[PDB]
Curated annotation (Swiss-Prot):
The chain holds residues 208 to 554 of 1102 of the full protein. Induction: Up-regulated in regulatory T-cells (Treg). Down-regulated during neural progenitor cell differentiation. Monomer. Homodimer. Part of a complex with DAXX, MDM2, RASSF1 and USP7. Part of a complex with DAXX, MDM2 and USP7. Interacts with MDM2; the interaction is independent of p53/TP53. Interacts with DAXX; the interaction is direct and independent of MDM2 and p53/TP53. Component of a complex composed of KMT2E/MLL5 (isoform 3), OGT (isoform 1) and USP7; the complex stabilizes KMT2E/MLL5, preventing KMT2E/MLL5 ubiquitination and proteasomal-mediated degradation. Interacts (via MATH domain) with KMT2E/MLL5 isoform 3. Interacts with OGT isoform 1. (Microbial infection) Isoform 1 and isoform 2 interact with herpesvirus 1 trans-acting transcriptional protein ICP0/VMW110. Binding to ICP0/VMW110 may modulate the substrate specificity or activity of USP7 to stabilize viral proteins. This is Ubiquitin carboxyl-terminal hydrolase 7. It comes from Homo sapiens. Isoform 1: Phosphorylated. Isoform 2: Not phosphorylated. The gene is USP7. Residues 7-310 form the USP domain.
Length: 343
């Protein structure tokens, strides 16, 4: 527990965003407690993702030394030298959360995942010259925001909700009305208590023919008002979000360094999580110094932000204690440790 109170994770290969993401998920206290509850007795230690995540969280909560992740990577089968380089942070997140959600089904914590991370959107198509619209609900668990050519997060949200023209030769097939010029877009109906925003600095194949990293300046705030992107708003619960995590990458596309900044209590007291080294830092370092740019004469910037709904903040970050871990689970991990101590 060091001197920040918090312990790091081991550098065990090119796992890229993984340690950052695990720290982010660990300090989503409501998720952690829920994960502690899954009926993982009788699971195979080798094969079980639920158990493997239980183990890592337990270690992060009790261990005074940097925590290993080997059994975690084995279980969801990303073990080759470059398996994390072939995926992104939002893909690993879904891998983890889907295993966990699937374990929680039929348990006293079923629905913890959609409760904390799921939001609702309306996807619509409006024809210009014919009276036809098709409104359909879409669920999301995270949001990929465009950052290229945008000054900040507000412009990104503006761009995300911008109307798109559908015109021949890209006309909408309007059924009985045949091919029709249309407008399509999305609107938000609900925003989740925990909001995962990926910033698209790392981008596809610009036709020819690399994955590249955009290191342009992109500003995000400590406090994020999203009411004006909602179809209708609640007077008693405005869509006000507070910045909780800034996942940072330093360098370019090919090779770089991965760090995450957290204020895991939600008070504005920030720590820097750099694998095994956890140290406290200024708020400027966690935030402004991660805007990116090319400024003094800079390759260090956020690719992912986590925001927490201010009204649900002090709950999402609710106290965890030792008693929140069931005895059966404590006993099992303790026995494994004892086996390991036999070398
Ligand atoms: Br390990
Ligand atoms: Br793979
Ligand atoms: Br990205
Ligand atoms: Br720039």
């Amino acid at each position: 527990k060091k001197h920040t109170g918090y312990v790091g994770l081991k550098n065990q290969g090119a796992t890229c965003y993984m340690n950052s993401l695990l720290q982010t998920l660990f300090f989503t206290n409501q998720l952690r407690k829920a994960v502690y509850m899954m009926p993982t007795e009788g699971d195979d230690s080798s094969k079980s993702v639920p158990l493997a995540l239980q183990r890592v969280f337990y270690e992060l909560q009790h261990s005074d030394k940097p925590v290993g992740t080997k059994k975690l990577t084995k279980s969801f089968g990303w073990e080759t030298l470059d398996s994390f380089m072939q995926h992104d942070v939002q893909e690993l997140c879904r891998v983890l959360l889907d295993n966990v959600e699937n374990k929680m089904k039929g348990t006293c914590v079923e629905g913890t995942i959609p409760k904390l991370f799921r939001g609702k959107m309306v996807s619509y198509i409006q024809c210009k010259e014919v009276d036809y619209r098709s409104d359909r609900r879409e669920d999301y668990y995270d949001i990929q925001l465009s950052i290229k050519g945008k000054k900040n997060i507000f412009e990104s949200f503006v761009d995300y909700v911008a109307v798109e023209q559908l015109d021949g030769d890209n006309k909408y097939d309007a059924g009985e009305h045949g091919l029709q010029e249309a407008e399509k877009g999305v609107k938000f109906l609900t925003l989740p208590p925990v909001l995962h925003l990926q910033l698209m600095r790392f981008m596809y194949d610009p036709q020819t023919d690399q994955n590249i990293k955009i290191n342009d300046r992109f500003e995000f705030p400590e406090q994020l008002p999203l009411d004006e992107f909602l179809q209708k708003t609640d007077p008693k619960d405005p869509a006000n979000y507070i910045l909780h995590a800034v996942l940072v990458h330093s360098g370019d596309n090919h090779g770089g360094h991965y760090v995450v900044y957290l204020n895991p209590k939600g008070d504005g007291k920030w720590c820097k999580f750099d694998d095994d080294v956890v140290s406290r830092c200024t708020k400027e370092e966690a935030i402004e110094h991660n805007y990116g740019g090319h400024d003094d004469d800079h390759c260090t910037n956020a690719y992912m932000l986590v925001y927490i709904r201010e009204s649900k903040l002090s709950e999402v970050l609710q106290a965890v204690t030792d008693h929140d871990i069931p005895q059966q689970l404590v006993e099992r991990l303790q026995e494994e440790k004892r086996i390991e101590a036999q070398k």
